[PDB]
Design a protein around this ligand. Structure first.
Ligand SMILES: CCCCCCCCCCCCCCCCCC(=O)OC[C@H](CO[C@@H]1O[C@H](CO[C@H]2O[C@H](CO)[C@H](O)[C@H](O)[C@H]2O)[C@H](O)[C@H](O)[C@H]1O)OC(=O)CCCCCCCCCCCCCCCCC
Ligand code: CLA
Ligand code: CLA
Ligand code: CLA
Ligand code: CLA
Ligand SMILES: CCCCCCCCCCCCCCCCCC(=O)OC[C@H](CO[C@@H]1O[C@H](CO)[C@H](O)[C@H](O)[C@H]1O)OC(=O)CCCCCCCCCCCCCCCCC
Ligand SMILES: CCCCCCCCCCCCCCCC(=O)OC[C@H](CO[C@@H]1O[C@H](CS(=O)(=O)O)[C@@H](O)[C@H](O)[C@H]1O)OC(=O)CCCCCCCCCCCCCCC
Ligand SMILES: CCCCCCCCCCCCCCCC(=O)OC[C@H](COP(=O)(O)OC[C@@H](O)CO)OC(=O)CCCCCCCCCCCCCCC
Ligand SMILES: CC1=C(/C=C/C(C)=C/C=C/C(C)=C/C=C/C=C(C)/C=C/C=C(C)/C=C/C2=C(C)CCCC2(C)C)C(C)(C)CCC1
Ligand SMILES: CC1=C(/C=C/C(C)=C/C=C/C(C)=C/C=C/C=C(C)/C=C/C=C(C)/C=C/C2=C(C)CCCC2(C)C)C(C)(C)CCC1
Ligand SMILES: CCCCCCCCCCCCO[C@@H]1O[C@H](CO)[C@@H](O[C@H]2O[C@H](CO)[C@@H](O)[C@H](O)[C@H]2O)[C@H](O)[C@H]1O
Ligand SMILES: CCCCCCCS[C@@H]1O[C@H](CO)[C@@H](O)[C@H](O)[C@H]1O
Ligand SMILES: O=C1C=C(Cl)C(=O)C(Cl)=C1
Ligand code: OEX
Ligand SMILES: [Cl-]
Ligand SMILES: [Mg+2]
Lengths: 172, 38, 30, 33, 34, 36, 80, 341, 505, 37, 63, 34
């Protein structure tokens, strides 16, 4: 639906019918947007951390950059000297082009997989199903966290569109 | 008097003191041997 | 009253779009 | 709809007070030499 | 002329030694039957 | 310190990872956790 | 370039693989036996497949007392 | 000079893995938090706290293992190994959920250590500590979700358990019980995370597609030198492109990169505030005017009333197994269900 | 020019106008306290401390006045329900007026310190530059804080020269202001022991006096002066923000879990009292003691105080509210009028059945009735076609003991079902829902709103601590890094010790 | 009265105005539903 | 700058800006009090938490 | 007292809109070069 609560309705019904949380393409999606947000904050903080002093203590440091100036406004060698010591030296991007390629690629690839998640659950190839996967020596079901998810999914399933189903299986 | 959980509290306190004590003793000893050269 | 309030804020945002685009501080090279 | 009556004044001041603060600062910036 | 036991050496092995032990454990588990 | 070519190490090490992960996927279908 | 021997130098040397052709499989086998002997179950208190329930029990042995919990698991375990 | 200065020297030596004063806190607590999680997910059950299997040893896979919270009857006990619950018994301690507070508390102090590391290194290399400042958002999320939220609730039991599927359950619980998607502080978090991912993608793509030709290779990565004075891409061309495509563009590179810090960091801080409210069940659960209209007018329906029916299903169908200490028995006839399903 | 988020930095080098700004802030806070008390006095109904106490009425500052001994109004009432009391000047109204007058005086002092900013006191005698000796200022202020802390404990809280503090029985039935003697044994550290609060302020005050004298007389070590940048007033802001968010987390915690300083007659019951059926257990204890002494069921339940029953009701649980459900609790379920009495449900066989109570987690909850062993015996079904436990099939009745409905029995299934729905909330009350146009939706109490604001503010002040601590320790690079910063200082291998030019190889 | 040497001019450029108004108006569009409730 | 009667009286209290004690001074003593305080906070926390349980200290409304 | 609910917003805007108009003009007068 084209609306805020309608979006939540679509998400909750999707989880009931496809177990999208247990689908690896949605998980890649989450890594895409969590990682995009992380690296956004990381890049922003590292460039901001290494701005070259061009201003006085009172004025905004943004005055230290003039639109269209040819010189880069931060010292990437200093930023990478910090970040390489935060992790280890080779985990850091010294090459700005490689860095900015990674900044583009990580969220774009993750969100591609998110889109493909929806587009393949569109044909009912659903998230992993481990309902009753663990069984004891007698045959008693030993629940896992997957089974608790299933119980929540059931509550969504039996309540959604409460007057629309006449037959026992929701087949689309 | 001294309850079992007070005894356990002392075990926790002493255990933490030892872990901290040994760590700083090892670090200080290592630092004295391998001195930076100026 | 609530509908009027929601549509008023939305309308102000669209007006803001127009000024932010067409009456922006022009970028100048240096 | 039975909405809260104070919602209108709450929203109006929420917009107007910080917006006028910014307008005051912007205009006195433009008028500086 | 390189040293052998360094800060890097310890950090590597505090991670690598348990990882191999654990991987041996998890491998054995693949043959447990109820 | 150089006698063993880096491409053989990378190939052998990569193959070991595939073997061990393959075993973990095999175990998803047999014994505990297999639902059977 | 901080003074330590490069990893590429290390993992392509014969001495490295002489050492670790012993240590790596030994750790792997030690971890295997930790499971295959059942010792992992007893160290961590994890139920074996025949130990989640008694034969006719239908109730899970949930801990319900904070300070007698240690004794509660001991009683649940002795009923198996 | 003295031993403190000698110790300071050795701590701050340039080496493959920088140690520092902050490392004395960071490395043990990070290692123990990670080791605790691997230990628990490999070997440790949740039978006695949740009635759940949760380890590889029991047959779980990477998606369903967890280190689970202690039983609700533990309350907010610190659950120290030497404490009055386990009394030094390592095995009992694992069965009681001791690994959960172990991971949460060492994890918290590890996070303190990591942010101290960011300050300490920034100070040593001479940069402003905005990276540490940005890290305050991860810390606000961790502290609000794993500490404040359960501290407002009945016990650690209702904190997130440390596992993939366990976290998914936490999401779904928050929908059904808290109507968390309706919460304006969560919505701001979503905007900050999604807007952050957008900024990440659009900035990386823009730089890469306004590069100057600084080499002859068709693969353009080699044509950069970190010490070079010149911008590697054209800010003027990027600005014109976005001005004509989208209507507005960045023109100040310092503002751009500050904005990239600001957006996801502020989003996470906002979500943390909403969770502090949920610690007290102080939810954005309902719109009173919707409920008054819907109660009096049985033909009035919105997507908001539809979602509450879903929440009511989640609560009734998940609570007996999700909250076993409550001993819920809901006879079939009381379960909310639509037609047929 | 200064950007908008930096305008207040003009005070950093101006001790006189910093004091003026602090005076103005103090004037506003005192002025808020006075206005808030007046607004509460204009809206507070004092006529029923049993079923309409302050915490049902959205009262936020009234309990803080009561906590420390202000319990009466100039108009003759007291919050313990007395009439015709003489509070003297220090009634709620006198407190409000005193804060308003303080606000005005502080405002005037701010004007003076703003105009006459250039006092020779604020100039370093040697350099002529603005200068504050922050280490000695700390000693002076800490010594003063110690004195006041000691006096508060030794005189006000003891009743030796002062009114004492609010104390109550474990079930919040007989609260009043009393003198409290200090507790010097280990029970003084029990959060529910009020004597520990007295002992705290005596001992902490004396420690503050001694430490204050130390900080007046001993200069900071050079090592610590340099490391904490003790010539920089922003270091004080950093550590002060840290102390303040520590304090704010503590008061959030003691408000939510309860202590001798967050009494339930002033702030309402806690959520944990519902979780543990704290009041239900005490009610049941009294009823079984009444029965053992030969009382009838009606007499036993009629001996239960309405105030005790009212605590055993989920509408007073602070974990039942909503972020945007504003106002007093009375705006939700209504103004409580009377206990209806204890509902006892029975099936046609005459077995007593018990309604399963609603846990705080649940916005809605089914109606399920069990026997004394927890076996399900009746419910209100959703689907009807396979119902087995309906009140109609099971012949469920309800009889009331105590309260308005004492001695009455209901058998009409819709009426019985209506009382069972109320019983999931605990004891059943009659409410006036008209006076406030109450909407029937639960709200939290002052205990909940206090906890929320202070945990939120505490978390935000963590960011403030991080920000100003960073500004303090990195002041030399606030405008950026050195334009001719040595590349060898950030690359690997040139220096043995990171960032130490004297350790180059 | 002698002039205070700590005074500074304050600035807000047009972009900051547009950014601030956007923040304010969007926050209002978001929170207004909850104010009306 | 303006002298006042009150300013002249308070002047010595704001005269030692920048004055320090040599070296580490009382840092060791300060560290001792910091450690005692840390143990103290740990004690009251564990009493409140019911991790430390003492005779005659019933952490409940019932005391 | 049953007052008109719009009385509050009417009074608030009546004060604020023209007061702010004057404050804008005053402040930008003060900031002009002297
Ligand atoms: C950013 C910061 C930087 C990062 C820092 C990261 C690492 C720091 C580590 C901190 C660890 C904190 C542990 C707190 C444990 C706790 O709280 O444990 C809880 C205990 C109280 O114990 C609880 O008490 C409850 C109420 O009991 C009372 O009520 C009952 C029913 O009536 C009975 O009468 C009972 O006897 C009586 O005690 C229940 O019984 C619970 O089961 C029981 O767990 O409080 C207490 O120990 C102490 C409470 C006061 C101090 C709280 C300060 C810290 C907490 C701040 C957050 C506040 C959250 C509020 C919600 C929002
Ligand atoms: C610096 C790193 C660090 C930090 C911050 C922590 C922190 C913690 N650990 Mg971890 N731990 C560490 C390293 C660390 N640990 C290491 C290296 C090991 C392996 C040995 C462990 C193994 C471990 C286990 C097995 C457990 C913990 C637990 C804990 C928690 C409770 C600790 C406590 O109460 O001690 C209190 C001790 C102190 C505060 C020491 C301070 C002493 C002061 C400064 C001086 C006082 C000295 C004293 C007077 C000496 C005399 C004692 C006498 C009176 C008896 C706490 C979060 C417990 C837990 O997580 O429960 C869920 C737990 O069960 N730790
Ligand atoms: C002139 C003295 C004076 C007196 C006798 C009062 C009295 C009162 N005030 Mg008012 N007030 C005053 C001045 C005064 N006020 C000033 C100057 C302000 C502006 C800041 C206020 C702003 C104010 C507000 C906003 C409120 C009151 C309230 C009240 C009432 C409750 C008091 C309370 O709970 O505080 C509790 C005080 C504390 C818990 C003190 C915390 C101290 C921390 C822990 C100090 C840590 C710092 C220290 C240096 C640490 C080291 C200590 C050392 C000993 C070791 C009480 C009638 C309340 C009320 O009912 O309003 C109607 C209320 O909400 N007052
Ligand atoms: C510590 C702060 C505090 C607390 C805990 C209380 C508590 C209480 N107040 Mg008091 N009050 C306060 C301060 C406080 N007050 C102040 C400062 C004023 C002057 C405005 C008042 C004036 C006042 C009045 C007039 C009344 C109360 C009433 C009450 C009671 C009901 C509260 C309610 O419905 O809240 C509802 C809370 C909310 C709706 C939450 C608001 C959250 C905001 C909107 C979020 C903003 C987000 C922000 C824009 C995000 C920016 C993002 C950006 C960084 C990108 C409750 C006991 C009522 C009462 O019953 O009196 C008897 C009542 O009528 N209070
Ligand atoms: C004792 C508390 C305290 C004090 C005295 C200061 C003081 C200062 N801050 Mg810090 N800060 C604090 C806590 C504090 N801060 C907290 C809790 C946070 C996290 C929210 C911050 C985050 C912070 C940042 C990110 C920055 C500062 C900056 C500054 C300096 C300039 C402030 C300014 O000109 O704002 C001018 C403010 C406005 C013109 C309007 C602000 C409107 C706010 C957002 C909404 C309305 C607030 C409302 C009236 C507050 C009610 C009271 C509240 C407690 C309930 C000044 C030294 C700035 C700086 O370092 O400059 C060099 C700076 O960039 N502070
Ligand atoms: C300068 C002036 C600036 C004015 C700003 C305008 C206000 C905008 C914000 C509105 C607040 C929300 C109120 C909307 C609904 C309403 O009408 O409330 C109305 C309520 C009053 O409640 C009313 O009371 C009545 C009987 O007294 C009736 O019951 C009414 O039905 C009831 O609505 O207003 C308040 O309670 C104000 C007190 C606020 C207490 C907040 C405590 C916690 C806050 C911490 C938040 C931290 C967030 C940090 C995020 C970063
Ligand atoms: C029950 C309590 C549980 C917890 C207790 C924990 C306490 C111990 C914590 C100690 C943590 C650090 C130990 C490792 C340090 C190290 O190996 O380097 C120290 C040097 C490194 O060599 C040197 O290494 C240098 C490089 S570097 O220092 O490794 O970076 C190199 O420059 C130099 O030439 C070379 O000689 O070698 C040693 O002297 C080892 C001494 C014994 C260490 C035991 C541990
Ligand atoms: C799956 C696709 C993975 C690569 C695409 C990642 C998303 C692109 C994001 C937006 C464009 C971001 C952008 O503009 O990228 C630009 C970046 C560099 O461009 P170059 O012109 O230097 O190289 C691309 C070609 O010209 C070949 O030299 O592209 C790459 O690095 C391609 C990587 C191929 C990796 C191997 C094949 C993987 C398939
Ligand atoms: C808890 C505790 C402790 C600790 C311990 C520890 C510290 C441990 C550690 C441990 C460890 C340290 C372990 C490890 C493990 C590891 C592992 C188990 C791994 C695995 C891996 C894998 C499986 C891989 C996968 C993959 C990926 C990830 C990607 C792609 C590729 C692949 C797929 C292959 C102590 C004693 C102190 C005390 C008591 C308690
Ligand atoms: C001058 C003078 C005088 C007078 C005085 C007066 C009359 C005063 C008043 C005062 C006042 C009357 C004051 C008031 C104040 C208030 C305030 C200051 C408030 C504030 C508020 C706030 C800040 C809020 C916020 C918020 C909101 C709004 C929403 C929710 C959230 C929050 C809470 C944040 C006299 C006669 C004495 C004489 C001397 C001189
Ligand atoms: C209900 C909402 C109300 C919100 C109210 C917000 C109030 C905001 C007050 C802003 C005050 C601005 O303060 C104003 O700053 C400018 C500079 O910026 C000063 O201007 C001064 O500097 C400028 C520039 O160097 C000189 O040209 C000018 O001659 C000089 O007087 C003014 O003397 C002062 O009046
Ligand atoms: C139809 C049965 C008799 C009427 C209802 C009896 C249950 S009790 C009933 O509950 C109401 C809230 O619904 C309260 O507002 C009211 O004070 C109280 O009488
Ligand atoms: O290694 C780096 C990683 C990131 Cl995300 C950066 O922004 C920079 Cl400048 C260097
Ligand atoms: O429409 Mn919308 O949701 Ca897809 O499933 Mn079938 O159909 Mn209805 O149900 Mn479930
Ligand atoms: Cl159908
Ligand atoms: Mg298997």
């Amino acid at each position: 639906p084209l609306g805020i609560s309608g979006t939540f309705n679509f998400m909750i019904v999707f989880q009931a019918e496809h177990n999208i949380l247990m689908h690896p393409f949605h998980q890649l999606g989450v890594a895409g947007v969590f990682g995009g947000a992380l690296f956004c904050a990381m890049h922003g903080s590292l460039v901001t951390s290494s701005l070259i002093r061009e201003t006085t203590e009172t004025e905004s440091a943004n005055y230290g950059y003039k639109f269209g100036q040819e010189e880069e406004t931060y010292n990437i060698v200093a930023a990478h000297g910090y970040f390489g010591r935060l992790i280890f030296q080779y985990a850091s991007f010294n090459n700005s082009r490689s860095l900015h390629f990674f900044l583009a690629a990580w969220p774009v690839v993750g969100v591609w997989f998110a889109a493909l998640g929806i587009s393949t659950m569109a044909f009912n190839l659903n998230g992993f199903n481990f309902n009753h996967s663990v069984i004891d020596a007698k045959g008693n079901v030993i629940n896992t966290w997957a089974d608790i998810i299933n119980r929540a999914n059931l509550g969504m399933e039996v309540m959604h569109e409460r007057n629309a189903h006449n037959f026992p299986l929701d087949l689309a | 008097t001294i309850t079992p959980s007070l005894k356990g509290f002392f075990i926790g306190l002493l255990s933490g003191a030892v872990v901290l004590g040994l760590t700083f003793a090892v670090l200080i000893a290592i630092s004295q041997i391998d001195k930076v050269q100026r | 009253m609530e509908t009027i309030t929601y549509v008023f804020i939305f309308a102000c945002i669209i007006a803001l779009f127009f000024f932010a685009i067409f009456f922006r501080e022009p970028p100048r090279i240096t | 709809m039975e909405v809260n009556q104070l919602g209108l004044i709450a929203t109006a001041l929420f917009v107007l007070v910080p917006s006028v603060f910014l307008i005051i600062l912007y205009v006195q910036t433009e008028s500086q030499q | 002329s390189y040293p052998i036991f360094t800060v890097r050496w310890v950090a590597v092995h505090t991670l690598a030694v348990p990882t191999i032990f654990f991987l041996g454990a998890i491998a054995a588990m693949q043959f447990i039957q109820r | 310190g150089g006698r063993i070519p880096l491409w053989i190490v990378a190939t052998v090490a990569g193959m070991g990872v595939i073997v061990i992960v393959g075993l973990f996927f095999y175990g998803a279908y047999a014994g505990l956790g297999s639902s059977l | 370039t901080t003074g330590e021997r490069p990893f590429s130098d290390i993992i392509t040397s014969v001495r490295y693989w002489v050492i670790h052709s012993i240590t790596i499989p030994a750790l792997f086998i030690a971890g295997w036996l930790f499971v295959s002997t059942g010792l992992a179950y007893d160290v961590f208190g994890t139920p074996r497949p025949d130990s989640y329930y008694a034969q006719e029990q239908r109730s899970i042995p949930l801990v319900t007392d904070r300070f007698e919990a240690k004794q509660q698991v001991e009683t649940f375990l002795e009923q198996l | 000079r003295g031993w403190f200065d000698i110790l300071d020297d050795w701590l701050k030596r340039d080496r493959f893995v920088f140690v520092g004063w902050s490392g004395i806190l960071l490395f043990p607590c990070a290692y123990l938090a990670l080791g605790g999680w691997l230990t628990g997910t490999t070997f440790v059950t949740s039978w006695y706290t949740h009635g759940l299997a949760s380890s590889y040893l029991e047959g779980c896979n990477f998606l369903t293992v967890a280190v689970s919270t202690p039983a609700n009857s533990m309350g907010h006990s610190l659950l120290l190994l030497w404490g009055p619950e386990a009394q030094g018994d390592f095995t009992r301690w694992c069965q009681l959920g001791g690994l959960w507070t172990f991971i949460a508390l060492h994890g918290a102090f590890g996070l303190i250590g990591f942010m101290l590391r960011q300050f300490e290194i920034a100070r040593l290399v001479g940069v402003r500590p905005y990276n540490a400042i940005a890290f305050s958002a991860p810390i606000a999320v961790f502290v609000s979700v794993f500490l404040i939220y359960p501290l407002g609730q009945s016990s650690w039991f209702f904190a997130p358990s440390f596992g993939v599927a366990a976290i998914f359950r936490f999401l779904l619980f928050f929908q059904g019980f808290h109507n968390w998607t309706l919460n304006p502080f969560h919505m701001m978090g979503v905007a900050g995370v999604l807007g952050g991912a957008l900024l990440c993608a659009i900035h990386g793509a823009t730089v890469e597609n306004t590069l100057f030709q600084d080499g002859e290779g068709a693969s353009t990565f080699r044509a950069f030198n970190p010490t070079q004075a010149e911008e590697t891409y054209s800010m003027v061309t990027a600005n014109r492109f976005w001005s004509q495509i989208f209507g507005i563009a960045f023109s100040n590179k310092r503002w751009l990169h500050f904005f990239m810090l600001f957006v996801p960091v502020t989003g996470l801080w906002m979500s943390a505030i909403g969770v502090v409210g949920l610690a007290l069940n102080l939810r954005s659960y309902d719109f009173i005017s919707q409920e008054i209209r819907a109660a009096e007018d049985p033909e009035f329906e919105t997507f908001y009333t539809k979602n509450l029916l879903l929440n009511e299903g989640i609560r009734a169908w998940m609570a007996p197994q999700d909250q076993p200490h409550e001993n819920f028995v809901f006879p079939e006839e009381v379960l909310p269900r639509g037609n047929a399903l | 020019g200064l950007p908008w988020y930096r305008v207040h930095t003009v005070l950093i080098n101006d001790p006189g106008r910093l004091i003026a700004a602090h005076l103005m802030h103090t004037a506003l806070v005192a002025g808020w306290a006075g206005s808030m008390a007046l607004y509460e006095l204009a809206t507070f109904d004092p006529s029923d401390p049993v079923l309409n106490p302050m915490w049902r009425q959205g009262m936020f500052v009234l309990p803080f006045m009561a906590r420390l001994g202000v319990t009466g109004s100039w108009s003759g009432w007291s919050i313990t329900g007395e009439t015709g009391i003489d509070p003297g000047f220090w009634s709620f109204e006198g407190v409000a007026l005193a804060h308003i007058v303080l606000s005005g005086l502080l405002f005037l002092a701010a004007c003076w310190h703003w105009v006459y900013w250039d006092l020779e006191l604020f100039r370093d005698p040697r350099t002529g530059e603005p200068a504050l000796d922050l280490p000695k200022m700390f000693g002076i202020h800490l010594f003063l804080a110690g004195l006041l802390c000691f006096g508060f404990g030794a005189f006000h809280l003891t009743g030796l020269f002062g009114p004492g503090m609010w104390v109550s029985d474990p079930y919040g039935l007989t609260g009043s202001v009393q003198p409290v003697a200090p507790e010097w044994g280990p029970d003084g550290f029990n959060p529910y022991n009020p004597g520990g609060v007295v002992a705290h302020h005596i001992a902490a005050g004396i420690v503050g006096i001694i430490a204050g004298l130390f900080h007046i007389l001993v200069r900071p070590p050079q090592r610590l002066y340099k490391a904490l940048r003790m010539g920089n007033i922003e270091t004080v802001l950093s550590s002060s923000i840290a102390a303040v968010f520590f304090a704010a987390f503590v008061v959030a915690g003691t408000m939510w879990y309860g202590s001798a300083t967050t009494p339930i007659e002033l702030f309402g019951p806690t959520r944990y009292q519902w979780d543990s059926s704290y009041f239900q257990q005490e009610i049941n204890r009294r009823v079984q003691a009444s029965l053992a002494s030969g009382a009838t069921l009606e007499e036993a339940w009629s001996a239960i105080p309405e105030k005790l029953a009212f605590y055993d009701y989920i509408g007073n649980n602070p974990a039942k509210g909503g972020l945007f459900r504003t106002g007093p609790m009375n705006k939700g379920d209504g103004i409580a009028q009377a206990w209806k009495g204890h509902a006892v449900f029975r099936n046609k066989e005459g077995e007593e059945l018990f309604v399963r109570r609603m846990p705080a987690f649940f916005e809605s909850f089914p109606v399920i009735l069990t026997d004394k062993n927890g076996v399900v015996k009746a419910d209100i079904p959703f689907r009807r076609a396979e119902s087995k436990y309906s009140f109609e099939q099971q012949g469920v009745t309800v009889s009331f003991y105590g309260g308005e409905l004492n001695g009455q029995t209901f058998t009409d299934p819709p009426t019985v079902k209506s009382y069972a729905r109320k019983a999931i909330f605990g004891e059943i009350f009659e409410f006036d829902t008209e006076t406030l146009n109450s909407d029937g939706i639960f709200r939290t109490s002052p205990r909940g709103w206090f906890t929320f604001a202070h945990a939120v503010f505490a978390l935000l002040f963590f960011f403030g601590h991080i920000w100003h601590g960073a500004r303090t320790l990195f002041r030399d690079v606030f405008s950026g890094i050195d334009p001719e910063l040595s590349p060898e200082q950030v690359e690997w291998g040139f220096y043995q010790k990171v960032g130490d030019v004297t350790t180059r190889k | 009265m002698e002039p205070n040497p700590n005074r500074q001019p304050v600035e807000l450029n047009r972009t900051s105005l547009y950014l601030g108004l956007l923040l304010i108006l969007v926050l209002a569009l978001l929170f207004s539903s909850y104010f009306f409730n | 700058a303006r002298r006042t009667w009150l300013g002249d009286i308070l002047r010595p209290l704001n005269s030692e800006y920048g004055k320090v004690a040599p070296g580490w001074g009382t840092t060791p003593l300060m560290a001792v009090f910091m450690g005692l305080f840390l143990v103290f906070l740990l004690i009251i926390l564990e009493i409140y938490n019911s991790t430390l349980i003492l005779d005659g200290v019933n952490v409940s409304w019932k005391a």
